Amino acid sequence: QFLRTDDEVVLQCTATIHKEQQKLCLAAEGFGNRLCFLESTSNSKNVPPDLSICTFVLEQSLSVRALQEMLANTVEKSEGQVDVEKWKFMMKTAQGGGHRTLLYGHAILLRHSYSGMYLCCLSTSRSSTDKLAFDVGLQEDTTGEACWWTIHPASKQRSEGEKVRVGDDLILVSVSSERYLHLSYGNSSWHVDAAFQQTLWSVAPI
């Protein structure tokens, strides 16, 4: 069982505090500040109350090198058109791409299924003046690295380049801010932000 692109998934994280443990799924909405948050699951009494907001699609999965190269070529260059026909070349590139397995170390593109937007590492902290963690929300455009998250192995069992299994605890890192998709304990609830601290994420096809 491997994670494939275009696969509909939900990102979860185990949150423990006050001798109490629970699971939360990365949720979001296309309205408002489109800021991401977390939903409590199976609390009464199975899975997140609103799974829709915790629904994501593994749109893309490129190597950091390839991704940065692609973005670099889109800065100032007349060449670099994948669709020259453009239609035919587009059909070939689409059918040639994938439909591809996720590899550890690869930068992925998560599209919030509901809002149709993409998980993004916003440059706004809105948590402190120390610029500790940034905000993680939704973005319409994918141009850049903010909407890209490199997946990393939780334990020493998984290695870079290895196939990502369904159920593998992934560590997401914002390509733009090099910050992890961290789990934060605000006021009295759980939130999600891009911090310099890891957080194991359970990406399951759902």
From Swiss-Prot:
Effect of disrupting the coding gene: Embryonically lethal. Embryos die at about 10 dpc, due to defects in heart tube development. Cardiac myotubes display enlarged rough endoplasmic reticulum and cytoplasmic vesicles that contain high levels of Ca(2+).
Similarity comment: family membership: Belongs to the ryanodine receptor (TC 1.A.3.1) family. RYR2 subfamily.
Organism: Mus musculus
Recorded superkingdom: Eukaryota
Signal peptide: none
Function: Cytosolic calcium-activated calcium channel that mediates the release of Ca(2+) from the sarcoplasmic reticulum into the cytosol and thereby plays a key role in triggering cardiac muscle contraction. Aberrant channel activation can lead to cardiac arrhythmia. In cardiac myocytes, calcium release is triggered by increased Ca(2+) cytosolic levels due to activation of the L-type calcium channel CACNA1C. The calcium channel activity is modulated by formation of heterotetramers with RYR3. Required for cellular calcium ion homeostasis. Required for embryonic heart development.
Domain notes per entry: The calcium release channel activity resides in the C-terminal region while the remaining part of the protein resides in the cytoplasm.
Compartments, record wording: Sarcoplasmic reticulum membrane
Subunit relationships: Homotetramer. Can also form heterotetramers with RYR1 and RYR3. Interacts with CALM and S100A1; these interactions regulate channel activity. Identified in a complex composed of RYR2, FKBP1B, PKA catalytic subunit, PRKAR2A, AKAP6, and the protein phosphatases PP2A and PP1. Interacts directly with FKBP1B, PKA, PP1 and PP2A. Interacts with FKBP1A and FKBP1B; these interactions may stabilize the channel in its closed state and prevent Ca(2+) leaks. Interacts with SELENON. Identified in a complex, composed of FSD2, CMYA5 and RYR2.
Tissue and organ expression note: Highly expressed in heart, lung, cerebellum and brain. Detected at lower levels in adrenal gland, stomach, thymus, esophagus and ovary.
Residue ranges occupied by any MIR domain in the UniProt entry: 99-154, 161-206
Protein name as annotated: Ryanodine receptor 2
PTM comment text: Channel activity is modulated by phosphorylation. Phosphorylation is increased in failing heart, leading to calcium leaks and increased cytoplasmic Ca(2+) levels.
